[PDB]
Amino acid sequence: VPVIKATRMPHYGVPFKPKLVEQRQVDVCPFSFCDRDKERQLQKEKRLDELRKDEVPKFKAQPLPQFDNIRLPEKKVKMPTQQEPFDLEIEKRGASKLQRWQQQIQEELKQQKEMVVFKARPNTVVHQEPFVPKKENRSLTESLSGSIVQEGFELATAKRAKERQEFDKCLAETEAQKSLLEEEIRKRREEEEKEEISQLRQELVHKAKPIRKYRAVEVKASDVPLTVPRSPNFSDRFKC
């Protein structure tokens, strides 16, 4: 079944892709934060803190950490990922490709910027990708709580000033609802065109190795562009 409820261990090197992340439905997919971060733990946790560069998000992206979140040790990629563009969290490849990473995990979301920002300070680990509270969304204090200094959905420092009255206290949690869901799901409620944008419009997101990322045929997925698995140490494409 396409369910997260993933075991803790290296993200890209934890159960990868049964198919879809936990639900595959904005109504029964918590990346909400009334009190459902607890299941969501899995997604948030893995790359953030210690791997504090640019959150490879709490995946509302492709399935439970399949390729996403921390780094991939050479002794953990015992089993291969199923279907993905990149499994570039990969110490070789990936972490190097990590600059290129920014395009796919970002671009499926309209907003994008220098992610090897939003984790280099106190709670700036809540960009519209890692977005949840608790110890991280302490607000947007005074000197260095990490306002999202980068923009989070809106929630960068200075991008408080005009917005503050309707913004923070009232809209910020509802802001959070549109946030994370908007990223990779990119749907909100209607318009499936918003989804499958990662491949289709311009986003020559990863020119890596030709990926039949051409999900326009086995559109039966989720949050991930139906991408053929990236090849590891085989020159021949993983297809054959």
Curated annotation (Swiss-Prot):
PTM notes: Phosphorylated during mitosis. Hyperphosphorylated upon assembly of microtubules.
Location in or out of the cell: Nucleus; Cytoplasm, Cytoskeleton, Spindle; Cytoplasm, Cytoskeleton, Spindle pole
Main function: Spindle assembly factor. Required for normal assembly of mitotic spindles. Mediates the binding kif15 and aurka to spindle microtubules. Required for targeting kif15 to microtubule minus ends. Activates aurka by promoting its autophosphorylation and protects the phosphorylated residue against dephosphorylation.
Protein family per UniProt: Belongs to the TPX2 family.
Subunit structure: Associates with microtubules. Interacts with aurka and plk1. Interacts with kif15.
Protein name stated in the entry: Targeting protein for Xklp2-A
Organism: Xenopus laevis (African clawed frog)
Complete-protein stretch covered: 477 to 716 of 716
